[PDB]
């Protein structure tokens, strides 16, 4: 197919070590993940992700209160700024320090930033968006003032409301007031008196009093009055009080000045909020067992945003309604596996932490959590209905959920207690195939009754990965006994055919045309077989085609290094012509199934917290104490809860201590999508959802020389030869033009043009009508289209049935959306109104 997959959106991880933001419009939420920033539009449920990707993880996110501009800064101080409404990246710029503090003035003319001690204020750059005849400058920032009046970490800064003074809350129990420009009746001044360093300091609305809130939970209100001896006045404290949190510190502090109310989150994972100037406790509640890393507030002041670092645990809390706005939970140990749904709407993930969760593709959310398993959860799968889901997890239970009533309407377990590493289901929705790692036998249970059916056996080792051929004729096993094994079950003999390989198996796949199997073994090569005539027909040795390495404490050269040279998981294209294949590496590879050559190679992550994202480390990282990314930096922590190391000596797998500084990047799963056009990869960067990029690329199908957009419009308008115009439009293959003509033609000539249309073009046509039926609101018209289409070309469509497989599936989901979208309401309304009409 058309294989040019630019990077569409991040997904499924939801908050990283970072700082939350609101659009000043008050609706959209900016939040950092890894090294990209996703936006959640809240009003319409939507999310996306920008096209940049820093190297190290995000550390600061500041906005231009106009709304259009964004500056995000990484650890070690690399910085990127983007224009938001046109999502492009503008500039790259290097602070010489690892940034900690950041705020833009509400006037939107300068910003202040707090590096490890130094304080800075730079201008804002004149954007090509903002000047009419404008250009990218070279040096886009100009540096206004620096300040070295200060003795420790500078941990928060905040502008005034008149954009003339700003407050600097330090880490050395001090705060300082600073002039934007040289005022007359003024001295830049200090404020001292706390007991453990201040986290926040802000102006009042009427900028006379200022608050500070200091780390042991002590809030001080200061006024600029005379000394107690009465020209002479002095910044002193009018009064003070303390949050009565018994047994922690607060880490996070914020406060709306317009509505005079303050919020503070503490290390025990409770937060509270207060009507400030009178100091009454509005209320308080515990969100999360770990702690709060960052709190920030609505521009209007209705909403509160909490980011909890150590988990996903974003939550946005409406306070005056005492209600959640959302409570999301990105995963917190890695993701063993995933699938799409035969809906195509949404994807389901299964982590090794214990929760499984259903993400929606649009709107970036885990719609549902289930936490019925007590252990790490490996593989996940779907029966062809797409309403039953099967998980298999280390606790020894295959749980079988229903997803339209949300309950585990079975569980399964082997007699002697086993631990399923791998599984799948028959596509019947009637039989479950599981494979352990303790006992090599491969069990099969009946769905419809649950009691065990058959322990298949034959295997000289544990059985490594399993799948049913999508028709349901064949179960396929691969085991580490060098061997792959065709189990034909539902035949009356339940026969077995061996297949000798070269080494251990790792992952299996089928073709939707159920004749072909693709098995990915341990040397790394793929071997491609035809099922019936069990003969190998193709093979690809892709070791150098996947090696990317050089982790921390990986003392082989990145080339030589063992164990990053095999595909942990392959998967087939929905059109049935291209493998996708990713695993313990840096790269995802994309292979041609027949020509056997490499289509494409993607890198999974540009990040540098992770280890294996660059195939050469560097000298000036290496110190005479080994690599610098091995120092147990735990001692320099301020919190005891951060000084402890409740680790375990030597557990690769699930160990709660979570030492988890500098981990690997394993492409633990990949999956295409049942509408084609897009796939995804489960990585420890979260989950990445790639799609094709059509609209950003002009692609002529089989063009001529006389077919311009204007030519199409002319023959559309003057000549009105609608069939000819349409076939030219598709031939040109551009979205806006095809949209235009499709909207233009009359809904009476529709039968004429479709009856005279060419069937080579007809599938691409079907797809386009699907996209229109979904997202454009001209529903009835699009339905007349799809009616005439199938009514004209039934037997050709039924004749092929497979060459259009994605087009079929997308039109079916489209009319399903319409179906469940409207006709339920229509019938329900007419029934109700008929009843009340009939009294």
């Amino acid at each position: 197919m058309k294989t040019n997959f630019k990077f569409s959106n991040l997904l499924g991880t939801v908050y990283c070590r970072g700082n939350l933001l609101f659009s000043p419009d008050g609706t959209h939420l900016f939040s950092p993940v890894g090294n990209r920033v996703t936006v959640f539009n809240l009003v319409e449920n939507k999310s996306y992700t920008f096209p940049f990707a820093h190297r190290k993880n995000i550390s600061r996110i500041g906005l231009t209160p106009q709304g259009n501009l964004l500056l995000s800064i990484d650890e070690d101080g690399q910085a990127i700024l983007t224009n938001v409404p046109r999502r492009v990246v503008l500039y790259h710029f290097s602070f010489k320090s690892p940034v900690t503090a950041l705020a833009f003035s509400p006037s939107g003319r300068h910003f202040v930033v707090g590096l490890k001690r130094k304080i800075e204020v730079w201008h804002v750059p004149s954007t090509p968006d903002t000047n009419e005849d404008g250009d990218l400058e070279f040096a886009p920032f100009v540096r206004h003032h620096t300040h070295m009046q200060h003795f420790d970490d500078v941990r928060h800064l905040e502008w005034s409301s008149d954009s003339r003074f700003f407050l600097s809350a330090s880490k050395d129990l001090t705060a300082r007031i600073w002039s934007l420009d040289t005022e007359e009746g003024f001295v830049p001044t200090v404020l001292s008196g706390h007991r453990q360093g201040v986290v926040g300091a802000y102006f009042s609305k009427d900028q006379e009093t200022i608050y500070t809130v200091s780390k042991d939970g002590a809030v001080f209100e200061w006024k600029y009055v005379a000394k107690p001896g009465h020209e002479d006045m002095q910044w002193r404290i009018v009064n003070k009080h303390f949050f009565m949190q018994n047994a922690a510190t607060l880490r996070c502090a914020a406060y709306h000045a317009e509505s005079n109310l303050l919020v503070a989150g503490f290390s025990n994972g409770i937060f509270g909020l207060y009507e400030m100037p009178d100091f009454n406790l509005i209320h308080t509640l515990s969100i999360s067992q770990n702690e709060i890393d960052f709190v920030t507030i609505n521009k209007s002041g209705e909403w509160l945003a909490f980011g909890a670092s150590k988990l996903g645990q974003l939550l946005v809390w409406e306070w005056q309604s005492e209600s959640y706005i959302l409570k999301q939970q990105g995963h917190f140990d890695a993701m063993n596996s995933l699938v799409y749904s035969p809906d195509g709407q949404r994807i389901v993930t299964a982590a090794d932490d214990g929760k499984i969760k259903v993400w929606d593709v649009e709107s970036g959310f885990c719609i549902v959590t289930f936490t019925e398993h007590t252990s790490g959860v490996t593989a996940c799968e779907f029966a062809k209905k797409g309403s039953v889901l099967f998980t298999a997890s280390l606790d020894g239970s295959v749980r079988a959920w229903d997803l339209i009533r949300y309950r585990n309407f079975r569980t399964f377990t082997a007699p002697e207690r086993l631990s399923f590493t791998c599984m799948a289901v028959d596509p019947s929705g009637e039989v479950i195939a599981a494979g352990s790692i303790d006992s090599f036998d491969i069990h099969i249970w009946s769905v419809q009754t649950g009691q065990l059916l058959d322990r298949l056996s034959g295997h000289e080792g544990p059985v490594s990965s399993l799948a049913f051929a999508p028709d349901g004729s064949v179960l396929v096993s691969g085991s580490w006994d060098r061997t792959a094994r065709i189990w034909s079950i539902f035949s009356r003999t339940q026969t077995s055919e061996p297949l000798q390989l070269q080494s251990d198996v790792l992952d299996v796949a089928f073709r939707p045309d159920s004749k072909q199997i693709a098995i990915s073994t341990l040397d790394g090569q793929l071997t491609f077989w035809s099922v019936s005539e069990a003969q190998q027909v193709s093979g690809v040795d892709g070791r150098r085609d996947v090696s990317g390495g050089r982790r921390i404490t990986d003392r082989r050269t990145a080339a030589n290094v063992a164990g990053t040279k095999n595909f942990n998981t392959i998967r087939y294209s929905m059109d049935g012509t291209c493998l996708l294949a990713g695993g313990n590496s840096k790269y995802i590879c994309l292979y041609s199934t027949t020509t056997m050559v490499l289509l494409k190679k993607f890198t999974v992550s540009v990040n540098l917290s992770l280890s294996g994202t660059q195939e050469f480390l560097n000298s000036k990282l290496m110190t005479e104490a080994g690599p610098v990314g091995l120092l147990d930096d735990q001692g320099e922590a301020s919190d005891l809860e951060d000084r402890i190391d409740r680790s375990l000596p030597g557990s690769k797998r699930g160990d709660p201590g979570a030492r988890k500084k500098f981990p690997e990047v394993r492409v633990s799963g990949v999956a295409f999508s049942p509408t084609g056009n897009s796939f995804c990869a489960a990585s420890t960067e979260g989950l990445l959802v790639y799609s094709l990029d059509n609209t950003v690329q002009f692609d002529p199908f089989d063009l001529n020389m006389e077919i311009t957009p204007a030519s199409t419009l002319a023959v559309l308008e003057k000549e009105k030869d609608y069939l000819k115009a349409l076939v030219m439009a598709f031939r040109l293959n551009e979205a806006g033009l095809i949209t235009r003509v499709y909207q233009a033609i009359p809904y009476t000539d529709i039968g004429l043009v479709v009856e005279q249309f060419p069937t080579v073009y007809v599938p691409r046509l079907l797809r386009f009508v699907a996209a229109q039926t979904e997202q454009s609101p001209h529903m009835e018209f699009c339905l007349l289209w799809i009616r005439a289409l199938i009514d004209k070309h039934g037997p050709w469509l039924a004749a092929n049935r497979g060459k259009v497989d994605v087009e079929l599936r997308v039109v079916a989901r489209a009319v399903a959306k319409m179906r469940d979208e409207i006709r339920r309401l229509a019938d329900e309304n007419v029934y109700m109104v008929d009843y009340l009409l009939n009294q």
Binding site: L42, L326, K327, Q329, I367, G396, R405, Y406, R407, R417
Partner: protein, 49 residues
């Protein structure tokens, strides 16, 4: 080896699938989504001796 299966009971309600989900400003589910009761007609009633 994990453990022998100890039997565990867990109660479900009469309220809907939206009550099962987590917290977010919209339900993803459709409009016929929401009026299903998370339990079955069997659960609310079956005739019996």
């Amino acid at each position: 080896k994990p453990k022998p299966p100890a039997p565990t009971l867990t109660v479900v309600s009469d309220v809907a699938t939206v009550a099962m989900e987590d917290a977010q400003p919209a339900t993803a589910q459709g409009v016929a989504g929401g009026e299903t009761s998370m339990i079955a007609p069997q659960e609310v009633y079956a005739p019996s001796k």
